[PDB]
Amino acid sequence: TREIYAEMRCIPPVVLRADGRNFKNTLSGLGFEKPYDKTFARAMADTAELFIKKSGLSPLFAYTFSDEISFLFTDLPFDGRVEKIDSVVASFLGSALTIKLRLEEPIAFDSRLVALQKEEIPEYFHRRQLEAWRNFVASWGYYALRNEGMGRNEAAKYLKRKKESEIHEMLFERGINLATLPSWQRRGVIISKEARKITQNWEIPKFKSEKGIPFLEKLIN
Amino acid sequence: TREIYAEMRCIPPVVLRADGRNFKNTLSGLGFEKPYDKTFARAMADTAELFIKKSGLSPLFAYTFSDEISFLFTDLPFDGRVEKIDSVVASFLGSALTIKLRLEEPIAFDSRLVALQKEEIPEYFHRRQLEAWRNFVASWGYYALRNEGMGRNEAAKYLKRKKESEIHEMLFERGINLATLPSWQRRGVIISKEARKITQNWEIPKFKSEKGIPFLEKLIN
Amino acid sequence: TREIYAEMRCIPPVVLRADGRNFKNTLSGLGFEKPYDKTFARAMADTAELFIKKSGLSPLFAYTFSDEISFLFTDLPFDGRVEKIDSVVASFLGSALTIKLRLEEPIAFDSRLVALQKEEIPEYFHRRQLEAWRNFVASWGYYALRNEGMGRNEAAKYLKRKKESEIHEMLFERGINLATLPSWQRRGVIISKEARKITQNWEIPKFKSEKGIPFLEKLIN
Amino acid sequence: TREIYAEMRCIPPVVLRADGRNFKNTLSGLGFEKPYDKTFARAMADTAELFIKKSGLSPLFAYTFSDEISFLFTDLPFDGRVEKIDSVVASFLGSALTIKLRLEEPIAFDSRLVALQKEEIPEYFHRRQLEAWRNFVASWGYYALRNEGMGRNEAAKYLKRKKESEIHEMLFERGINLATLPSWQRRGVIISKEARKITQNWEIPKFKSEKGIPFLEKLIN
Numbered sequence A, B, C, D: 001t002r003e004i005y006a007e008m009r010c011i012p013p014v015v016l017r018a019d020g021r022n023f024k025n026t027l028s029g030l031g032f033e034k035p036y037d038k039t040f041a042r043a044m045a046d047t048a049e050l051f052i053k054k055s056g057l058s059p060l061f062a063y064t065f066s067d068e069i070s071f072l073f074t075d076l077p078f079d080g081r082v083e084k085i086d087s088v089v090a091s092f093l094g095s096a097l098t099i100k101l102r103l104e105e106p107i108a109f110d111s112r113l114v115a116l117q118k119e120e121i122p123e124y125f126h127r128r129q130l131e132a133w134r135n136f137v138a139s140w141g142y143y144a145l146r147n148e149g150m151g152r153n154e155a156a157k158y159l160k161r162k163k164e165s166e167i168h169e170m171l172f173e174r175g176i177n178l179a180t181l182p183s184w185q186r187r188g189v190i191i192s193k194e195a196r197k198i199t200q201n202w203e204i205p206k207f208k209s210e211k212g213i214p215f216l217e218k219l220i221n
């Protein structure tokens, strides 16, 4: 039995997180608008929808931001076989996104299982939302720096020195109010099955908040 | 650290085997010739070549047949991390094949690592070649049945009941001598870097045989 | 990094189940009373108590029956490292039991992690209790058969043919009422820390029952 | 199937390394000679011998030093199941050592599988022997410090600061020439079946050396 990891398994509930491999370069090459591009974001949400619709697996919902998607699973696919789940889902995502962006050169996602207790499920997504936000700010800050005639290394360097408030200040000065930028850039996008139509929510609440908590709770059941 | 399998690793030498998931249905739509179609076989060999060419990983070679490819790895990618290797390679394969076949609907590979001792490396491929043969015959048997007015299930029962000799005889009666068919249908295709151009060998020797042994031995180093 | 499984981890809550290796033979040899021996049972409960008291790990409680002990863990030891947890706990159990039975020849436990959702924790132990019961009956039936001048193989053979009721009948006929045999033989023994004194309960309720449910619920918190 | 790691396996050749857990404290009570004690070393070699003799498993040989033993396995026990192998072997070792030292308080080993290519097998043991040496020197350094009126922490600081030459010099000044000490303290002990009696070699060659190479090579076959 040389296929030693082909037995490794998991238990419900689990979260599959797939992240685009080397997407910084691969998206710089093709000429995507920076720091955000609604075509790419729509491609990713459409990828998630297509997964929920035609993968033959049954996630409760997907949450996507940046170059990554997370699928909540209660019903485990492939008997919980980690290799099979990770590989198949990553492959399907690669194919789907390749279709949706009409790519001429191949791309790849990485995938990983996150084992969780049910009670922990909101926190995880909260964490992820936070990360999304932390991308948002940085993504714009960085941009502004490059627009002010800065080198890449210098921009990263300076970007580390100042914290979120100072970045807000810098961006607000130059005409960019981060609070009025679209919801999906700072909070991400939810894709879920409802009573059955698959719907994309592009205006989701902040998870750890008054409207966010029952929202997530209703998503999870 | 909820990402429990994200640290799990392997050791050289390893073989990554990716197998097309449910390729029967998802690819049936376009009308590929049955039981073998050089357009699909060329697509798979092209996928393997493209992997060797632009993945940024370094397999020694690929061996492909049916809907599957095996990559020999001595230099392990991603520090030998099983999740990352399986997911990323499967994903890249999905993307590549989606490009080469210009697919409108998404597909997926499953992937798995096969842990091996160097001494076992030839045997594995021999095993795989054997499987290829077992595919070959079977693939034709079924086909013949379809031309002779058979139900799919009807085709399954008989095919399971009789062994290779009687099947060979049937195919010869129904007009098909398997010995006149091209080498790659029964032996598969090798993709490797040679004297340096990446080359597809569509006329490979039987691995466990007098000309096959030094061939494989030179492939592996 | 040749120590590939040294990274494999888990998440709370988990149950460690250790089972005496080849204990049938090893206990037949030393001359333990069959089918139950309160000296061995006391040794096992004392082993569990000693584990809770001096292992330096922190299970919520242990449940023991036959040649096996299960430890409920909420606080995970050794960062959840499966190898380290299994090996260390198995080793400690071997040592402890070796002390308590004053053994001249070495013994071993096997160990395994059971990954569970909190909501599933009662069911598991219920399952185990059921198994305990299924041992109980069989253990006596078997005994009776050997007492009626039967060979081992014949006794097992016949034992499979009849179900629990018929066994109850057989044993009740020969003077043995299974309902009046001690609680620990049919329900097992609980060992837990209380507000801190470690106490052994040798008269536990049936878990799936009116008195059993709040009992287990109070054990788990 | 909540027992998710219970299927995880490995491939030959493998090395099981068991290391005494917290042996500093738990064994300190009896008053073992420091920094080395032939009673404990004999106990460990006896444990390895007893394992080879009555475990029912079949290692090729054991190598032991300090509080640790390594077993070379080509024939894998328990179908190569990692949980079962680690837990059972660790447990047996705990029991055996508990018997040979006649302990009143329980002890534990941790265990781990080391996956190796045959070509790597000597190197591993070389590495281990190196570790043995690094133990040896250090073990004495500390000791000397204790005789020269040092705090434990005080002993740690200096010992970390200086490298082997200066330490050698210190020990020579404080009366101890390490070259006159017995071979096993710096090289460890081998336990293997020989011409067939199970034998303990307490005078083994340096593994990576002219006489060591054919020695190890004959041990491994």
Ligand SMILES: Nc1nc2c(ncn2[C@@H]2O[C@H](COP(=O)(O)OP(=O)(O)OP(=O)(O)O)[C@@H](O)[C@H]2O)c(=O)[nH]1
Pocket: A019, A020, A021, A022, A023, A024, A025, A027, A028, A032, A033, A034, A035, A036, A037, A038, A040, A041, A066, A067
């Ligand atoms: N231009 C552009 N870039 C994007 C967009 N969304 C995500 N990205 C890129 O995605 C990256 C997200 O960080 P990472 O996932 O760590 O980047 P990566 O190259 O994929 O790194 P790895 O996944 O580890 O290979 C950012 O650096 C962005 O440049 C987008 O909408 N437009």
Ligand SMILES: Nc1nc2c(ncn2[C@@H]2O[C@H](COP(=O)(O)OP(=O)(O)OP(=O)(O)O)[C@@H](O)[C@H]2O)c(=O)[nH]1
Pocket: B019, B020, B021, B022, B023, B024, B032, B033, B034, B035, B036, B037, B038, B040, B041, B066, B067
């Ligand atoms: N028409 C056609 N079909 C092919 C060709 N090559 C492979 N296939 C199909 O691919 C299938 C391969 O079977 P498997 O890989 O064992 O399993 P699967 O059908 O892909 O389903 P999975 O278990 O998810 O992999 C066969 O049933 C074939 O029908 C081809 O060249 N032409």
Ligand SMILES: Nc1nc2c(ncn2[C@@H]2O[C@H](COP(=O)(O)OP(=O)(O)OP(=O)(O)O)[C@@H](O)[C@H]2O)c(=O)[nH]1
Pocket: C019, C020, C021, C022, C023, C024, C025, C027, C028, C032, C033, C034, C035, C036, C037, C038, C040, C041, C066, C067
């Ligand atoms: N005489 C006697 N035997 C007992 C007692 N408790 C448990 N056993 C033995 O323990 C066995 C329990 O079944 P198993 O755990 O599958 O037996 P095993 O030999 O340990 O099998 P493995 O664990 O797979 O190696 C029974 O066959 C009993 O004979 C006892 O109190 N007295």
Ligand SMILES: Nc1nc2c(ncn2[C@@H]2O[C@H](COP(=O)(O)OP(=O)(O)OP(=O)(O)O)[C@@H](O)[C@H]2O)c(=O)[nH]1
Pocket: D019, D020, D021, D022, D023, D024, D032, D033, D034, D035, D036, D037, D038, D040, D041, D066, D067
């Ligand atoms: N007195 C005495 N102590 C020994 C002897 N051999 C080994 N030891 C002790 O065993 C310890 C081995 O250290 P490690 O195996 O690295 O770690 P540990 O102290 O056992 O703690 P763990 O990390 O749980 O293994 C040393 O600190 C020694 O003090 C001996 O022969 N005599």
Ligand SMILES: [Mg+2]
Pocket: A019, A020, A021, A022, A023, A067
């Ligand atoms: Mg990325």
Ligand SMILES: [Mg+2]
Pocket: A019, A020, A066, A067, A068
């Ligand atoms: Mg990312």
Ligand SMILES: [Mg+2]
Pocket: B019, B020, B021, B022, B023, B067
């Ligand atoms: Mg397939």
Ligand SMILES: [Mg+2]
Pocket: B019, B020, B066, B067, B068
């Ligand atoms: Mg196939």
Ligand SMILES: [Mg+2]
Pocket: C019, C020, C021, C022, C023, C067
């Ligand atoms: Mg047992």
Ligand SMILES: [Mg+2]
Pocket: C019, C020, C066, C067, C068
């Ligand atoms: Mg048992």
Ligand SMILES: [Mg+2]
Pocket: D019, D020, D021, D022, D023, D067
């Ligand atoms: Mg130790």
Ligand SMILES: [Mg+2]
Pocket: D019, D020, D066, D067, D068
């Ligand atoms: Mg040690």
